[PDB]
Amino acid sequence: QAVVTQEPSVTVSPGGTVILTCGSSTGAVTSGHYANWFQQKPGQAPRALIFETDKKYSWTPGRFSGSLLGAKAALTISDAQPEDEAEYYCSLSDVDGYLFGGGTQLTVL
């Protein structure tokens, strides 16, 4: 009966490291939720970045990694670049289906 939780907005300094987190409203997020992350720039088609908590696609920037941090799924963006300014969407899953968070708007300073 849980929903996916994401901080609405988050900032980072250029060259800085920022951690986006994705939570469950009822409990802890584990690797059993197979967290996926998606990047979206306004008006544009969303792009898949991370699957199965920490797996990258061939096109996933080396700067980006997924992991579990505490009771949450986490997307770490190292060495932030201007082109990383986007909405980041988290999806969590179980046997009853998959749900999306409302996204985090990342601003690069």
Ligand X SMILES: CN(C)c1ccc(C(c2ccc(O)cc2)c2ccc(N(C)C)cc2)cc1
Rounded to a whole number of angstroms, the minimum distance from the CB of residue 109 to its own copies is 26
Position among 1, 58, 62, 82 found at the interface with its own copies (CB under 8 A): 58
Token readout for 26 is 């009822």
Give the neighbor-by-neighbor strand order of the sheet with 64-69. 4-6, 18-24, 72-77, 64-69
Asked whether position 97 contacts its own copies by CB under 8 A, the answer is: yes
- The answer to whether the beta carbons of residues 80 and 13 sit under 8 Å apart is yes
Which part of the chain contacts its own copies (CB under 8 A), choosing from 10-18, 21-29, 73-81, 95-103?
A: 95-103
Per-residue interface string for the shown chain with its own copies, residues 17-46, x marking contact by CB under 8 A: ---------------x-x---------xxx
Closest-CA residue to 73 (of 38, 40, 34): 34
Distance CA 12, CA 104 (A): 12
Rounded to a whole number of angstroms, the minimum distance from the CB of residue 12 to ligand X is 25
Of 78 and 93, the one with the shorter C-beta distance to ligand X is 93
Asked whether position 60 contacts ligand X by CB under 6 A, the answer is: no
